Amino acid sequence: YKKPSDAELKRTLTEEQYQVTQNSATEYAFSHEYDHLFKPGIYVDVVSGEPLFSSADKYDSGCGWPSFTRPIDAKSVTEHDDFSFNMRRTEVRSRAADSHLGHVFPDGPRDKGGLRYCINGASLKFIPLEQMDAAGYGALKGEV
Ligand SMILES: C[As](C)(=O)[O-]
């Protein structure tokens, strides 16, 4: 899982996908299809295809963006202090392509770890269970 050149990205990603993953922009709350999508499968980095979240950990937090209790693999994402626009939050970015994904907060389901990963649907690509094998993610079916 690798990240193409900035120049190549400009010609493959939509304006929205590019602004969110490359410039850390934020999609309008409740605007993405993935917000209310709850079907079996996984969500991968729109840029590199790296698996990031599983349908197994997706839940309704009412925050406005796809929400998960944890990443599909602890190593899949990286955390960063975000002192953007007068406040302190923890930014979440993908490991391989370093795409801006969203933020994580300490107010998630307590029995699931207590974390809430709020992610832009524009930074993801959903792979339904029925297509995971063909897509090359067969080994991850155990995570749904
Ligand atoms: C707008 As957000 C999904 O980075 O808390």
From Swiss-Prot:
Domain notes: Possesses 2 methionine sulfoxide reductase domains (A/MsrA and B/MsrB) and 1 N-terminal thioredoxin domain. The domain B exhibits a thioredoxin dependent methionine sulfoxide reductase activity; the Cys-118 is probably involved in the reduction of MetSO and in formation of the sulfenic acid derivative. The regeneration of Cys-118 is probably done via formation of a disulfide bond with Cys-63 followed by its reduction by thioredoxin.
Domain of life: Bacteria
Encoding gene per record: msrAB
Entry similarity comment: In the N-terminal section; belongs to the thioredoxin family. In the central section; belongs to the MsrA Met sulfoxide reductase family.
Domain named MsrB: residues: 6-129
Species the sequence originates in: Neisseria gonorrhoeae
Protein name (record): Peptide methionine sulfoxide reductase MsrA/MsrB
Disulfide bond residue pairs: 63-118
Role according to the record: Has an important function as a repair enzyme for proteins that have been inactivated by oxidation. Catalyzes the reversible oxidation-reduction of methionine sulfoxide in proteins to methionine.
Active-site residues per Swiss-Prot or TrEMBL entry: 118
Disruption phenotype: Hyperpiliated and hyperadherent.
